[PDB]
């Protein structure tokens, strides 16, 4: 276990739910609830990571960590941006079927998640070294 790791897992779990694009997710995507929920989980994750690095200081590499940290932050934002895009494309469809939009979202979302996953594992690996 590890605080920032647990917070990241909550964001992770939340996003995996969104990926399902179930009825409740779809309702929520058309409000700002999903992106607000994610923004909070994202903020918590970044807060904990900052506290964690700060404490690790007490036991080039810093700029590589700061940037792997940045990658994660940008990946989380990219996801939300894609979610905002979806709400807008739905509005633009003027009530017309969104199934096609959802197929496309799911596939893109899957890739943005794969990215986030690889940047979190990298960040973890650098930390595991910074550890000791």
Curated annotation (Swiss-Prot):
Changing residue 104 to C: In HLPP3; ApoE2-type. Changing residue 126 to C: In HLPP3; ApoE2, ApoE2 Fukuoka, ApoE1 Weisgraber and ApoE3**; ApoE3** is associated with HLPP3; changed protein structure; decreased binding to LDLR and other lipoprotein receptors; decreased in vitro binding to heparin; no effect on distribution among plasma lipoproteins. Changing residue 114 to E: In HLPP3; ApoE1 Harrisburg; decreased binding to LDL receptor; probable dominant negative effect; decreased in vitro binding to heparin. The modification Phosphoserine is found at residue 97. Sequence repeats lie at residues 40-59, 60-73, 74-95, 96-117, 118-132. Changing residue 39 to T: Changes the plasma lipoprotein distribution of ApoE4 to the HDL. Glycans are attached at residue 53. Changing residue 113 to C: In HLPP3; also found in a patient with hypercholesterolemia; ApoE4 Philadelphia and ApoE2-type. Changing residue 118 to A: Decreased binding to LDL receptor. Changing residue 108 to A: Decreased binding to LDL receptor. Changing residue 20 to A: In ApoE3 Freiburg. Heparin binds at residues 112-115. Homotetramer. May interact with ABCA1; functionally associated with ABCA1 in the biogenesis of HDLs. May interact with APP/A4 amyloid-beta peptide; the interaction is extremely stable in vitro but its physiological significance is unclear. May interact with MAPT. May interact with MAP2. In the cerebrospinal fluid, interacts with secreted SORL1. Interacts with PMEL; this allows the loading of PMEL luminal fragment on ILVs to induce fibril nucleation. (Microbial infection) Interacts with hepatitis C virus (HCV) envelope glycoprotein E2; this interaction is required for HCV infectivity and production. APOE is an apolipoprotein, a protein associating with lipid particles, that mainly functions in lipoprotein-mediated lipid transport between organs via the plasma and interstitial fluids. APOE is a core component of plasma lipoproteins and is involved in their production, conversion and clearance. Apolipoproteins are amphipathic molecules that interact both with lipids of the lipoprotein particle core and the aqueous environment of the plasma. (Microbial infection) Through its interaction with HCV envelope glycoprotein E2, participates in the attachment of HCV to HSPGs and other receptors (LDLr, VLDLr, and SR-B1) on the cell surface and to the assembly, maturation and infectivity of HCV viral particles. This interaction is probably promoted via the up-regulation of cellular autophagy by the virus. This is Apolipoprotein E. It comes from Homo sapiens (Human). The chain holds residues 41 to 182 of 317 of the full protein.
């Amino acid at each position: 276990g590890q605080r920032w790791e647990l917070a990241l897992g909550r964001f992770w779990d939340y996003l995996r739910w969104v990926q399902t694009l179930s009825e409740q997710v779809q309702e929520e995507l058309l409000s700002s609830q999903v992106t607000q929920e994610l923004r909070a989980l994202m903020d918590e994750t970044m807060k904990e990571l900052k506290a964690y690095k700060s404490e690790l200081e007490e036991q080039r590499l810093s700029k590589e960590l700061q940037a792997a940290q940045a990658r994660l932050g940008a990946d989380m934002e990219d996801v939300c941006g894609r979610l905002v895009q979806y709400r807008g494309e739905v509005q633009a469809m003027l009530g017309q079927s969104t199934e096609e939009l959802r197929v496309r979202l799911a596939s893109h979302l899957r890739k943005l998640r794969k990215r986030l996953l690889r940047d979190a594992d990298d960040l973890q690996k650098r930390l595991a070294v910074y550890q000791a």
